[PDB]
Ligand binder design. Structure first.
Ligand SMILES: N[C@@H](Cc1cc(-c2ccc(Cl)cc2Cl)cc(CP(=O)(O)O)c1O)C(=O)O
Ligand SMILES: *[C@@H]1O[C@H](CO)[C@@H](O)[C@H](O)[C@H]1NC(C)=O
Lengths: 238, 79, 147, 286, 101, 152
């Protein structure tokens, strides 16, 4: 009876007599109607989750060094005939050749191949991607964090060697860094829309992978029931 | 909010006059009302193995209707 | 101007200039030079991210300048022991400085001299964003072990 | 006064196809089988130690209907039925919970948060905004530089007079409009399907015009200041503007309606139908 | 063999005692040495500070602190350590290309 | 340090600096142990020195937004004969792949990760009301039982 009352009305029950017990049971029922409410309520909080971007390391992680454990989707791609390839072609030559079946054209034909599921990831120059990340509105396409870039170089000014102008332009650029101006130009020119945080997306339909847990417990109870049927059936000597 | 009631009356009438084919003339509305809101009281519920299925369809409808109400109402409580 | 770093905007006949955070820039373009046709004409008016760095530097260190585009060989790519484009133009003394998109590496630190880097850059990866899912064990979250 | 934006106040209307939406179309089948699975498995563990009754009990614990009267008499079958009831509770709890979670986050749109909204900084053909040609607003945008692209976009659509821009917003031929606040606010009050986005822009003040060095200047600019302490302009204000006939607050969360709950009524009708068939089969089996 | 002065925190008699150090910079330093044939010694700053200008003597005389001051005073020769890059230090010192952004 | 150099000669941060002067510490080794004791509420430093913390320990975490940009460097007295060779040998170590090796050997452990801090399941200390009421129900029963026997 009480089990049924806690979860919900299951079956007829020869429930009480004993006008006192007819009150203990009602206290339990009240407790149940509050307990189920608390459960249904708080569970409605665990069903609002945030977007999820994978925590992948740099080019050095397993997902490219040993790109055959999860064979299907490993699709490190690139753009042909350029400075991008040579650095790859000189440190990961095998992992260079593997990419041979993934040469795109331009950069848009590659950014598109990440919204139509043709490709896994994409390798290119940082500061152009970042500005290109702030372009598209479909923020489902955003690069990994910095501090993982491979060959950290910069952008520089070319001076005829041995000139005396060099020292002064250096001090001037460090000046522009010093008083926050650089952020002003950077923000006006490069940083666009998609400096946003991951949304609270309502789930899609619950699916069997999500709700498998209840079914495994259902089956385990089936097995335990079988086991008790067996144990009781041991009673053929009494 | 009233399509519910009209379906209620219709199903009750057809339920009893399907039960006629193989004590249960107005006790229906009692039963179905109880089933929509929640279990209230003993009921001389059916016979007539067909009606034992119409009623179950109604019960399913109820368990979905109460869920929709409780759910959407939880939106009107954030101001 | 192979970048969104510096941009050229064709000359305006509505006024004759741009003057709105912009600057003029030449292009002594030679083309179809089979009849010794003398080259040169004012191509588009210039503006962009590196251009503003340029202006502020010029006003802070007090010089003036003369902006003009390249002709061939967008960036420096050595051919037969010679440099073509934005690095030749510095090694042949036909210029003094070169600004814009121009990285840093040993292969260039012998011909020309380099400033302090003002951006980070390098090789990095793009990925897509995975939607939010539910643990296979959600239905046990909302109650601590005791209760 | 200053400048503001005038957008169309969307009417909230909840998006929902049918009651199946919180469940992947497979899960329905999975439970529709597992019910019978446990039914059969229960039918055995009482004989080897009532079939229709067991099937009723099984397929009726989940439906919360009281129909069905039998009960497992074994030990094993009792231990099963208990957790069967539990799992049935979990199913409905999760369904209504996830439905609640979806119905909260289903909110219509986001009003423009002013001029700093990036939705305006980038031009798109799916978002058009304009003003009146040859006015002070285009004077403000032209000689501004950070709004170069903004202006470059507007030039293609600007209208002739606000009397046209308003009738063009209320027809969804446009998506925004920029003008003098004190001329828009009179709109959000007279009509109440339009509403503004609050943030006050470039600041100004209306004035009177006289040719330079006219004998009338000083007396006029004095008589104005008199009309701001005796209380005259307040009277003109109240007589002509500030009606507040319509007010907005906390656009509702869009109650459900007859056009999306249509699934369950379809299923109960279909239940009515199938009954008129499966009735006779009884008479036959008799 | 890190030759450290800071046997104890500042505010107590210092008894400069040998220690040993390692990590990012020491490895980079060893690479440089193999490349350019040095023989190095290392001793930790006696200040425990990075270094900046400050008035002294209740006067306007501007002096530095810590390791930067230990360089400008010739007390050191090279700062192989996590030192940032700014304008205000660039007017007395020579900064290599950056090795970590 | 360099952070106070950045804040002092900035003007929009006049009040900020005016606040900080009263608490600044001696070395990050103290500021970290002072944050993990709730004697402080924030700390500002070089990213690449903080990120190693959010990974080794995992009760601290940073707030993402990247600030004033710089780059570490080596120091030599002005006009030293060693300058050019050093600043070359660096650039070699960024294409052969040496600095990547040093990186991986010393930083980038990612031992702890954070994602979507949970919505804080209930516990034994707030549901205590209902269990109190069911206990109290047990009690009252042992009283109202005898009253039945009396009324019999
Ligand atoms: N910056 C390099 C040249 C250089 C430039 C670009 C590039 C081109 C267009 C745009 Cl809009 C943005 C960028 Cl960053 C890309 C790469 C890389 P890759 O060409 O192999 O694809 C490159 O090397 C230099 O200093 O020579
Ligand atoms: C995530 O959900 C959105 C919802 O519109 C959908 O467009 C997108 O394709 C989904 N992405 C994945 C990887 O399932």
């Amino acid at each position: 009876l009480l089990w049924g009352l806690v979860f919900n009305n299951s079956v007829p029950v020869q429930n009480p007599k004993g006008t006192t017990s007819k009150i203990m049971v009602s206290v339990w029922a009240f407790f149940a109607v509050i307990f189920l409410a608390s459960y249904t309520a708080n569970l409605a909080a665990f069903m609002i989750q945030e977007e999820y971007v994978d925590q992948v390391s740099g080019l050095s992680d397993k997902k490219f060094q040993r790109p055959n454990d999860f064979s299907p989707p490993f699709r490190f791609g690139t753009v042909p005939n350029g400075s991008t390839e040579r650095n790859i072609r000189n440190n990961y030559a095998e992992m260079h050749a593997y990419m041979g079946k993934f040469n795109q054209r331009g950069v848009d034909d590659a950014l598109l191949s990440l919204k139509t599921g043709k490709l896994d990831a994409f390798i290119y120059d940082a500061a152009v991607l970042n500005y290109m990340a702030g372009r598209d509105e479909g923020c489902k396409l955003v690069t990994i964090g910095s501090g993982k870039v491979f060959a950290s170089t910069g952008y520089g000014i070319a001076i005829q060697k041995d000139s005396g102008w060099k020292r002064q332009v250096d001090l001037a650029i460090l000046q522009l860094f010093g008083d926050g101006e650089m952020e002003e130009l950077e923000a006006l020119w490069l940083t666009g829309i998609c400096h946003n945080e991951k949304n609270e997306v309502m789930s899609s339909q619950l699916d069997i992978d999500n709700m498998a847990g209840v079914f495994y417990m259902l089956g385990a109870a089936m097995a335990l029931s079988l086991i008790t049927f067996i144990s009781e059936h041991l009673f053929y000597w009494q | 909010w009233v399509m519910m009631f009209v379906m209620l009356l219709i199903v009750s009438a057809v339920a009893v006059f399907v039960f006629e084919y193989f004590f249960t003339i107005g006790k229906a509305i009692w039963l179905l009302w109880g089933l929509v809101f929640n279990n209230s009281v003993p009921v001389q519920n059916p016979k007539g193995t067909t009606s034992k299925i119409m009623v179950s369809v109604w019960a399913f409808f109820a368990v979905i209707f109460l869920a929709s109400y409780t759910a959407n109402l939880a939106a009107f409580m954030i101001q | 101007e192979e970048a969104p770093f510096v941009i050229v905007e064709s000359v305006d006949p509505l006024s004759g200039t741009c003057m709105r955070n912009t600057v003029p820039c030449q292009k002594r373009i030679i083309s179809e030079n089979k009849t010794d046709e003398e080259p040169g004409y004012i191509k588009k008016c210039c503006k962009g991210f590196c251009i503003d760095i340029l202006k502020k530097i010029s006003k802070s260190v007090k010089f003036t300048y003369d902006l003009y585009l390249v002709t061939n060989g967008k960036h420096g790519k050595k051919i037969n022991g010679t440099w073509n484009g934005m690095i030749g133009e510095v090694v042949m003394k036909r210029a003094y400085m070169a600004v814009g998109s121009l990285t840093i590496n040993e292969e260039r630190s012998e011909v020309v001299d380099f400033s302090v880097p003002f951006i980070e850059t390098g090789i990095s990866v793009m990925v897509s964003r995975s939607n939010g899912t539910v643990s296979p064990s959600a239905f046990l979250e909302p109650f601590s072990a005791c209760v | 006064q200053g400048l503001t934006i005038l957008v169309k106040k969307e009417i909230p209307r909840s998006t929902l196809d049918s009651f199946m939406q919180p469940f992947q179309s497979t899960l329905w089948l999975l439970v529709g089988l597992s019910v019978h699975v446990v039914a059969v498995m229960l039918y055995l563990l009482d004989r080897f130690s009532t079939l229709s009754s067991a099937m009723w009990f099984s397929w009726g614990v989940l439906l919360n209907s009281g129909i069905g009267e039998g009960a497992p008499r074994s030990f094993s079958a009792r231990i099963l039925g208990m957790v069967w009831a539990g799992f049935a509770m979990i199913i409905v709890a999760s369904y209504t919970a996830n439905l609640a979670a979806f119905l909260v986050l289903d909110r219509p749109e986001e009003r423009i948060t002013g001029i700093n909204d990036p939705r305006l900084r980038n031009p798109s053909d799916k978002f058009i905004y304009a003003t009146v040609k040859q006015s002070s607003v285009d004077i403000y945008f032209r000689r501004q530089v950070e709004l170069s692209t903004m202006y470059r976009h507007m030039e293609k659509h600007n209208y002739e007079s606000a009397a046209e821009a308003i009738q063009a917003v209320r027809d969804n031929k446009l998506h925004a409009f920029i003008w003098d606040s004190a001329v828009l606010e009179f709109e959000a009050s007279q009509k109440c399907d339009l509403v503004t986005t609050g943030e006050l822009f470039f600041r100004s003040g209306f004035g009177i015009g006289m040719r330079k060095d006219s004998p009338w200047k000083q007396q006029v600019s004095l008589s104005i200041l008199k009309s701001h302490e005796n209380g005259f302009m307040e009277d003109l204000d109240k007589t002509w503007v500030r009606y507040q006939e319509c007010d907005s607050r906390s656009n509702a969360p869009a109650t459900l309606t007859c056009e999306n709950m249509a699934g369950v009524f379809m299923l109960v009708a279909g239940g009515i139908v199938a009954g008129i068939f499966l009735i006779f089969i009884e008479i036959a089996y008799k | 063999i890190c030759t450290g002065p800071n046997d104890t925190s500042p505010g107590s008699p210092r008894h400069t005692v040998p220690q040993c150090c390692y990590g990012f910079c020491i490895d980079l330093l060893i690479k440089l040495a193999r490349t350019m044939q040095f023989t190095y010694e290392v001793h930790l700053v006696a200040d425990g500070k990075f270094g900046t200008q400050e008035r002294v003597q209740n006067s306007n005389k501007k002096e530095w602190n810590g390791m930067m001051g230990e360089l400008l005073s010739g007390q050191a020769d090279m700062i192989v350590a996590p030192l940032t890059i700014n304008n205000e230090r660039a007017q007395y010192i020579e900064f290599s290309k950056p090795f970590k952004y």
